[PDB]
Design a protein around this nucleic acid. Structure first.
Ligand SMILES: [Zn+2]
Lengths: 135, 82, 178, 213, 325
RNA sequence: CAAGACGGACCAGAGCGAAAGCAUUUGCCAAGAAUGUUUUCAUUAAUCAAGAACGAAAGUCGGAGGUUCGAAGACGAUCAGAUACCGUCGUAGUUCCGACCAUAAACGAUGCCGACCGGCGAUGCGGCGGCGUUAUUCCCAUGACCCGCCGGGCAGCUUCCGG
């Protein structure tokens, strides 16, 4: 099962790596992006909410999603790194970096790295008050 | 410092100063005599003229007002009076 | 063969020029990668070659040079080359607390402290490296160490004095089984 | 239990004739199950493709949005939908001690595709400059923004999508704006940063044939 | 084959290439590197020590001060030069060498002296650094006697007078591309690129000028025809009164004013080395910072730290809450 | 697709305003400092009880609208005694229009006008004098830089003027 493409040419997928401040999401799609091939969250691998956003969970997610692409036949992936964005933090965290490193480790060719986070032009009001956020 | 002849300053020093801060007040402007390339009629034009001036016997603009000195049109010749 | 390009700002051109040999020597000796600096696009470009030893070394090189460009010392990103579990969390100072103007500047001050000492104090407790861009904070270290440093920094820029910050961060380091 | 991916089909998706590299790649589609038609399902997709995957000589910091419009038996033709810049490039372009000048026009081309053009331009520190900042005054900025608006309006209204796209690949518009704005203030990095598709005419078939081949 | 200390610093094992190996005691005994003294007791002993003649060191100095390089030269450097002179005079005929060398020819360009040309990793518009090229990048690499000099002054004087010299590469070198510092008040040139005050008039006025010397013996130097280089922008500013004591730092106007001793502690100047075999056993990935010592409280910094801050003009505006040391 | 919101990065010890305050594009409307003048009036001025306009945020009346946030409030966690911290939801409010209130660490914790007493070079605006590089060498002026000078400003550094 998979595309009828010769061994020379490779097929491309887009791996939405979304590392929020609670877990990670691995949404492998077509180059169009409409239909999903796979998505491995942090919570599907570790049975603990404390370890949900751990780099170990992202590493396991990247390994499992790479196994899923090898079972179908995707050999090279473009990367769209993402953070929570918007009003919240814009920079992707350690989970995205760990997932990208683990996916590059498991024999997978890397195409274009793109930092696509929903950066607002002008934000709405912040989640916290005037006092602050994060302890 | 502590030794300056305020009565007789050098002309370069007084030329550098602001026109109201001179030892005796004197303007920075003049009255220039302008000759048009076409006509032979001589015209007195103030150096910082604010209005556009027209030649009496040529009906041609001589100068255009600016922020400071009025710039002359191309081809006109000017001579400073004394 | 694949490659990664990373940009450099105008203020980071001269440290890149001075420390150039210390950058490209471990990239080309231990990792076996081709490296150049495109002056027109102002990008450090690293590509794999036929005699590259293994995969994921290109990502190690990209992390090394990007950590150097963000403001870390060349040895502190050589640590990224050697060690495996090292990451980079960075965040804006105005993220946790809405600060405007001079207040924001004072927050930067109490991340540095007098002589930078407070900053160095965190680097002794959380065992991390921290770089202050003009409104941005970058942490390099292990995951729990990055989280510890981030809690310390966010405690500093919410108004808490450095003494409470040192006491809390040393207590957390004590319970961290270090 | 039942794998849904055995019911899926792999279609080929191809670039238009404007670009050297045609084969965009593969597209997954569910099979026709009587009610819904497989060709109708993929008729409204936007394809994100970099310029390095389209022409070998060109630069990689430009992105094209493509609409798939027709199905020819495991072959998909794409039509131009938009153009954008890489966020890494845009982050690198915004330096501090300079002035950013932005313009936008709503312009209709000859064959009816109503587009929105965005143009950005940065002020340039010159060769013998000693001053730190290179700010332009407000009237100069307005004059530059004007000159961008009439340049884009002139060079889009008289062309069609073939000529407009063949202008946007090497960015004739940006170089024309840079050349024309030297008399007001010298500019550093001017591009058409984003192109939006506001309105499309009635869809035809011969237009897609002459656009593709 | 006269070996200078630059070949010994670079582990240039060219002992098999040549046969007439001649060295000085004071070009090998001053090296503080441990690995060089380690390999010295390991390397095959066919090098031998030879002393120059006072007449020949006198002649070498005589035309070296006509070349304009005599302040840049050192005593052991003159030993090496006159040793090569004596060897080539005693083996080869002396008619090959020419004295009182050629004049300079001036041809300026619009390029800045800080343009990053001839850097290996830098490439304008392909120039890549490959592990096949890491052994190749030494310098501009192009029969019996020669030199193993790495300093540009040695190459300059040896090529002006006319000896064929070589590098760590086995083949003889052809062209010498480098930079020099020229005073723009006294017009005296120094080959030492590290210094910042000139030897003649002592002002902080040395500026970079590029020099290329061909194999014939003809030298041409390029100035920069750029108004930014010779600009008096950040030069006149109000100076503080000179303070004394153990803690006072002075604005450094002369090359030899007595500064107070303000050194760093050992822990403050430890840099982490990552390729040590026992680095992985470290409880922390990094060397711990020093905050306990008195030097940490006095905000003592290294000479390297804060280099672009000095390049800002004092007559400017900094950030409101920042203080410049 | 729609809804209300907000004008990031450029954004600086830069600018404007009596202050509170002011940052998307374009058009219109009426003002304003400064600079330049060998223009005009000829003391028309300074500070100002009484009195009068503006006046952050929060709040109150009548209308519209409610995207985010969100006091109160509801739950959930946490305890010898917790009833503040934390998490989810969410009312008034936060938005606009027309009426009210005249309060801030409404701060330079420093009345306004005028004179004199050290220095320096950066910046914003205006004016003056200039070798040169630039608009692919521009055919003339003009814009951008470069070098000085003067005037009004936002500021800085230095000093045993003296306090
Ligand atoms: Zn000198």
């Amino acid at each position: 099962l998979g595309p009828q493409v010769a061994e020379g040419e490779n097929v491309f997928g887009v791996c939405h790596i979304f590392a929020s401040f609670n877990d990670t999401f691995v949404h492998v799609t077509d180059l169009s992006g409409k239909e999903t091939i796979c998505r491995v969250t942090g919570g599907m691998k570790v049975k603990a909410d404390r370890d949900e956003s751990s780099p170990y969970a992202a590493m396991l997610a990247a390994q499992d999603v790479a196994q899923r692409c090898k079972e179908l036949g995707i050999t090279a992936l473009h990367i769209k790194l993402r953070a929570t964005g918007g009003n919240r933090t814009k920079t992707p965290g350690p989970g995205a970096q760990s997932a990208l490193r683990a996916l590059a480790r498991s024999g997978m060719k890397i195409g274009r790295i793109e930092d696509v986070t929903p950066i607002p032009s002008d934000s709405t009001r912040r989640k916290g008050g005037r006092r602050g956020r994060r302890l | 410092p502590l030794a300056k002849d305020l009565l007789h300053p050098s002309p370069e020093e007084e030329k550098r100063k602001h026109k109201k801060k001179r030892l005796v007040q004197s303007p920075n402007s003049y009255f220039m005599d302008v000759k048009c390339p076409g006509c032979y009629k001589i015209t007195t034009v103030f150096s910082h003229a604010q209005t556009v001036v027209l030649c009496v016997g040529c009906s041609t603009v001589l100068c255009q007002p600016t922020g400071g000195k009025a710039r002359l049109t191309e081809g006109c010749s000017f001579r400073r009076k004394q | 063969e694949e490659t990664r390009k990373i940009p450099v700002p105008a203020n980071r051109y001269t440290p890149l020029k001075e420390n150039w040999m210390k950058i490209f020597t471990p990239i080309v000796e231990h990792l076996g990668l081709q490296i150049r600096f495109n002056l027109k696009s102002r990008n450090v470009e690293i590509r794999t070659c036929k005699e590259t030893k293994d995969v994921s070394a290109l990502t190690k090189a990209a992390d090394f040079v990007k950590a150097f460009i963000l403001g870390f010392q060349v040895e502190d990103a050589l640590a990224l080359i050697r060690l495996d579990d090292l990451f980079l969390e960075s965040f804006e100072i105005t993220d946790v607390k809405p600060l405007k103007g001079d207040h924001l500047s004072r927050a930067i001050g109490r991340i540095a402290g007098k002589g930078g000492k407070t900053k160095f104090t965190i680097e002794n407790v959380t065992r991390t490296r921290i770089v202050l861009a003009d409104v941005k904070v970058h942490i390099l270290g292990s995951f729990q160490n990055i989280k510890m440093a981030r809690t310390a920094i966010c405690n500093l820029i919410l108004g808490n004095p450095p003494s409470k910050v040192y006491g809390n961060i040393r207590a957390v380091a004590s319970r961290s089984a270090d | 239990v039942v794998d849904p991916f055995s019911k899926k089909d792999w279609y080929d998706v191809k670039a238009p004739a404007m670009f050297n590299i045609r084969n965009i790649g593969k597209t997954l589609v569910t099979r026709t199950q009587g009610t819904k038609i497989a060709s109708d399902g993929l008729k409204g997709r936007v394809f994100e493709v970099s310029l390095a995957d389209l022409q070998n000589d060109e630069v990689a910091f430009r992105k094209f949005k493509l609409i798939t419009e027709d199905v020819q038996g495991k072959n998909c033709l794409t039509n131009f939908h938009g153009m954008d810049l890489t966020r890494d490039k845009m982050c690198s372009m915004v330096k501090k001690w300079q002035t950013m000048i932005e313009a936008h026009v709503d312009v209709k081309t000859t064959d009816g595709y109503l587009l929105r053009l965005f143009c950005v331009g940065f002020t340039k520190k010159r060769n013998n400059q000693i001053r730190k900042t290179s700010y332009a005054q407000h009237q100069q900025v307005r004059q530059i923004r004007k000159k961008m608006m009439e340049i884009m309006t002139r060079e889009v209204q008289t062309n069609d999508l073939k000529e407009v796209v063949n202008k946007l690949i090497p960015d004739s518009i940006g170089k024309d704006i840079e050349k024309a704005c030297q008399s007001i203030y010298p500019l550093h990095d001017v591009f058409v940063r984003k192109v939006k598709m506001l309105k499309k005419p009635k869809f035809e078939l011969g237009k897609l044939m002459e656009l593709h081949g | 084959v006269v070996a200078d200390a630059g070949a010994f610093l670079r582990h240039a094992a060219l002992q098999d290439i040549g046969k007439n190996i001649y060295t000085i005691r004071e070009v090998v005994t001053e090296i503080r590197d441990k690995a060089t003294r380690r390999r010295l007791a390991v390397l095959p002993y066919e090098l031998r020590f030879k002393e120059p003649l006072p007449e020949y060191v006198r002649l070498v100095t005589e035309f070296s001060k006509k070349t304009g390089d005599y302040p840049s030269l050192s005593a052991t450097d003159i030993q090496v030069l006159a040793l090569t002179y004596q060897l080539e005079a005693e083996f080869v005929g002396v008619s090959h060498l020419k004295q009182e060398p050629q004049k300079v020819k001036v041809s300026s360009s619009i390029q800045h002296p800080e343009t990053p040309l001839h850097i290996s990793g830098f490439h304008l518009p392909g120039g890549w650094i490959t592990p096949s090229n890491i052994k190749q990048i030494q310098q501009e690499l192009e029969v019996r006697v020669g030199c193993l000099t790495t300093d540009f002054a040695m190459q300059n004087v040896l090529l002006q007078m006319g000896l064929h010299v070589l590098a760590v590469n086995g083949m003889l070198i052809r062209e010498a591309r480098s930079y020099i510092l020229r005073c723009h008040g006294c017009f005296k040139t120094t080959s030492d690129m590290s210094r910042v005050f000139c030897s003649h008039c002592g002002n902080k006025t040395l500026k970079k000028v590029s020099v290329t010397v061909s194999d014939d013996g003809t030298l041409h130097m390029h100035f920069s025809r750029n108004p930014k280089v010779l600009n008096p922008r950040g030069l006149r500013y109000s100076l503080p009164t000179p303070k004394g004591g153990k803690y006072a730092i002075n604005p450094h106007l002369t090359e030899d004013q007595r500064f107070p001793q303000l050194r760093l502690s050992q822990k403050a100047r430890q840099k982490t080395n990552v390729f040590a075999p026992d680095y992985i056993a470290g409880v922390s990935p990094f060397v711990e910072n020093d905050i306990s010592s008195r030097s940490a409280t006095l905000q003592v910094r290294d000479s390297t730290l804060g280099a672009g801050r000095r390049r800002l003009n004092p007559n400017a505006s900094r950030k409101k809450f920042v203080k410049k040391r």
